[PDB]
Paper text:
Cutinase is an esterase that belongs to the α/β-hydrolase superfamily and primarily hydrolyzes cutin from plants. Unlike lipases, cutinases lack the active site-covering lid structure such that the substrate-binding cleft is exposed and directly accessible from bulk solution. In addition, the substrate-binding site is more expansive in cutinases compared to esterases, benefiting the binding of bulkier macromolecules. In this work, we investigate the PBAT hydrolysis potency of cutinases and PET-degrading enzymes, and find that cutinases outcompete other reported enzymes.
Residue numbers in the entry: 41 to 301
The structure:
Amino acid sequence: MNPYERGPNPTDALLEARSGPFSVSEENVSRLSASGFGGGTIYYPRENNTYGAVAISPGYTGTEASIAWLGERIASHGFVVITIDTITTLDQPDSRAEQLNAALNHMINRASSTVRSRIDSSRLAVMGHAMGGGGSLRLASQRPDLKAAIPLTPWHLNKNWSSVTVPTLIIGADLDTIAPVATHAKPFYNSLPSSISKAYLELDGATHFAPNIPNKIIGKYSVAWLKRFVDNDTRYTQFLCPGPRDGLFGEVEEYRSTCPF
């Protein structure tokens, strides 16, 4: 009925697993093949179909290796995902925004036919870690046609994101000393309009480095957000609404959403 649906009916166990049901192959994007970003890796499902497409940016001083596990894991649930390097490791968030955009266009227009034929260019998403998450917010702001945005422990000097109407899941970490949730992630979530689809999930016992370490919470709710908004897959509403519990015996420090979507 929903022809964007891919994979079997979900459970906590399948969403928390290290790998989804799709086997994954990779396309290397060399620095000189890439226009407007530093190259990276495209993870894509071997099974021929069309899928939504995600661009992910690392943070200050980092490269694609620090978010590789995430590109693999998300692709293994039926998405085409690029993990980018930036032009320099020191690029600022609003520069990372522009480079994420360039990576979306690379996947759609300049990659091999193998990749291009597997992308529904109308269903795109953006993610990023730390300054990359800042880049996520800016691009989401600039491209309200994107289907989802997921800033992970995001970092940005601009705290006002009321121009964002893309469905946005911000993931904060309670022990993050580099982008403390009080001065970044929460003000980001709070300034996003109350009228859009958004959610704030704060990890419990997690540093700035948590998105760089295979993490079953991040993987589960990142895929669920993408399934729900890139594929319009309502089989995944159950994980977002009411969402993870932040109370007694809960899995999360804090979860806040505009459920129902």
